[PDB]
Amino acid sequence: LTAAESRIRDLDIADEMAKFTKNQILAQSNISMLAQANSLPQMALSLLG
Amino acid sequence: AMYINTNVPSLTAQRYLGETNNAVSKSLERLSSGLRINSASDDASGLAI
Numbered sequence: 001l002t003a004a005e006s007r008i009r010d011l012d013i014a015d016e017m018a019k020f021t022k023n024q025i026l027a028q029s030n031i032s033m034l035a036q037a038n039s040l041p042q043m044a045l046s047l048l049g
Numbered sequence: 050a051m052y053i054n055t056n057v058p059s060l061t062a063q064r065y066l067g068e069t070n071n072a073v074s075k076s077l078e079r080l081s082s083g084l085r086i087n088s089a090s091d092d093a094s095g096l097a098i
Contacts, residue, residue: 026083036077
């Protein structure tokens, strides 16, 4: 029974670590794209004027 | 021939600028999202699969 119950304790840590790494990598790309999205259009309009 | 209020090249430039801005917006959305299809209109057959 203690073998049976220790099957919903935690996953093999490798996949959790991989998910953590993937999300951490994606966050920085999101940040950079947000920065350039802020920068581009208003400055383009100001160049027009 | 020199006229007044015949700025056709301005209209042409405005049109081309409009299409360029639309393309920039779509590319930024795609790369920020990190997905190919998104929405429901990019591909009509991949969604069900």
